[PDB]
């Protein structure tokens, strides 16, 4: 009754706290190990608590006190009544040149800075640089605690060769904590590199730290840091664009960051860039569109399509429109015809068909009147199936935005081969006769 | 190509891939040598569709050739892809055994940095759940204990060792106590799936394991203890530890709702099959810690964990939820401390005095709170001294509903709820005629409140019927169907309004009810002869409308 409010209010409203609270509460309140030991840690202690509690006795429960609170080595004796006494004496005997000299000499001759620097650094120069620069579990724990505390305190309270060159040896040697290394390395490398060799120093972290945060944070971190640092100031563009574009919910961020950073960095600086960018974008868009269209069509027809259809249509339309508009200033016909026909044949029909169909005439423009026109009419007319928006939108937009190959091949093949299946003759004859007769052009030789 | 141009690699790879893909996919032991040599010396539709789209010769030849070729040729992606695809397709599609079990168990158990341990441990340990009981059941202790010595090794070794070692029992004290205590005393999918599957599928050890594991224990203890203790549901420790741990750990984002709802529902349902601590702590913590999970779980648990329980307990949840949401999402009033004064009731003048004094003294997005609070308070307080409640409720409802965009909701909600729970013509006719003629809740609320209030009871009938029928018919299915069905059904059991409004307003599928019901009821139930004969004969001139006129 009064022991909870009196002991909790009197003990919580104000060593001396453990002996006064445990002695007054235990001596005045006369199952008590969790309630009496949880209050001492939830809000010269091991010597007085272990000597008074062990000498004034109530055995194994005393070990629970080790989970609560130079003088802590005696607490190791509580684990008795080189492996059950050396951790408290070696870890508490050296509990700022004392931290780097005692931690480096004691750890090298055979966690306090990370857990103690947050209280003094968050509850309110030589210790961060000396402790972080002067640093098998001792290397990973001291390097991770000193690098995380120095990087978090120095980066949050407002050089990279030691942490970048030393993180791969301890992480690779100890892995045979990704948020602190990825956030501290990405924020320190992006802020230090952008506030003023990126492939060699950044390829070890992404190539050795792999596993979704390390592989997903490298696209936005390496693309934003490499694009902002490299663009804000020939091997960096080919190595970063080839490794970043060839090494790839991470599909939207990796495809958008790699396509936007590679297209903006490669177009913001010449047939090698347009041919390599058109071949890589056409091969990646054709492979991703063919794999997503085949997997979505087989999985949806063999019986999360909004994310794959919206991400594939938005990424393909944005990448094709950005690459065509930014680069227009035998793999192209098969990749563009197979990606456009396979990705477009599966209010979104007008924007998706117009934006996905305008890249052929807009990206082609000059020439491309035989291979680019024979594959669209042959591939689009040889499949049929159930489609009407792509034929009218692609035929009306492509034939009206410029046309003789579609009307001649469609009219000659449909009229000569025609002798659900009868709906292509009326729509093809009405669309071809209305578009060709209403286009107001010469040509003739068809009536 | 790594030292550097795209036409040579793209044209050589694309032009050279057709010979190996067409030759390897059209020439058929060749899939393992061609796929392993071609894929390892440097295609998914043909191998996946041909290998997955296809009785002892196929299983023995495919298992012996794939196991002998993979085990004999594997001594990085080819082993994990071929072993995972062949083991997943064969194990998932298979739902002669001596050669495959003895060869696969002896070769996989005798043939034994993250790719080798994860692919070898996951691929070699994933097929154990699909003479052999001794080596298969005894190889997991030496293989898991010798290969387990970073979350993939402990999760795959603990889940494969606990599932494989515990699945054969359907010496167990050391493996069950060490695996359950070591695996449960320590990333949420591995601990929750391994602890929930091992603790829920594994069953003197219940008292030491449950008391030591449940008493020796912040998200892992509450999630593992609540999920493991609630998935397979001595009652004082589980009820007090589950209610105190769930209320104290959840009272300080699906973990709090799932752990609190699962621990509260499993602890209350399992312990309700000492009541002051569980009822006061569960009612105070559940009623004070607070969209369908809270209303459904709080209303079903609070209304079912107690005929007067639902009506007498609906005012605390309705007044606490409406007063807490309205007083916490807008404030700027004086009704924020109503939970401590209104929730202190879970222990005919007590219900009327406590409900009328608490609701009238504590009641001093508005359509849901005003209609739900007025309808729930009036129906619950009136469905259970009559001069004070009737005069106070009629004077407060009539003065508050008549003394007020807010006029349609307040007048329609207060007049419809107060008049149906037992100056509107100018505002309803002007607002409905101006809003309906100057161009969804105004049509349903005005049509339902005006039709129900006007039809559920001499110038008011002619003015309201002529103005409502002329203004509503001179300009949509709810007004014609409700007015025609309510006027014809209520009047067929005055002839100028129904005959002139129905005959002058009915001139397509809803017109058969008025002519069929009026002609059938008026012609079969026998100034009415001129309106009935003129309206029926003039409006009936298609087999139902002409068969009754010519046959009757």
Numbering used by the authors:
A (entry chain B): 3 to 16, 21 to 36, 44 to 56, 70 to 83, 95 to 106, 114 to 125, 134 to 147, 188 to 202, ...
B (entry chain B): 1767 to 1770, 1773 to 1796, 1809 to 1822, 1838 to 1849, 1852 to 1872, 1875 to 1894, 1897 to 1913, 1916 to 1933, ...
Cite, word for word, the article reporting this structure.
Here we present the cryo-EM structure of the entire SAGA complex where the major target of activator binding, the 430 kDa Tra1 protein is resolved with an average resolution of 5.7 Å. SAGA is organized into two lobes, one of which is fully occupied by Tra1 while the second contains enzymatic and chromatin recognition functions. We find a sequence motif that seems essential for the intricate HEAT domain architecture of Tra1, we identify a structural core shared by other PIKKs including TOR, and we illuminate a resemblance between Tra1 and DNA-PK, a PIKK involved in DNA repair.
While lobe B improved only modestly due to uncorrelated domain movements, the resolution in lobe A reached 5.7 Å, thus showing clear density for helices and several connecting loops. The HEAT repeats form a central solenoid overlaid by a ring structure and adopt a cradle shape when viewed from the side. Extending the tail, the central solenoid comprises 11 regular HEAT repeats up to residue 928. Within the shifted TRD2 domain, three consecutive helices that are highly conserved among Tra1 proteins (residues 2698–2753) form a bearing-like module that accepts a rod-shaped density, probably an α-helix, originating from lobe B.
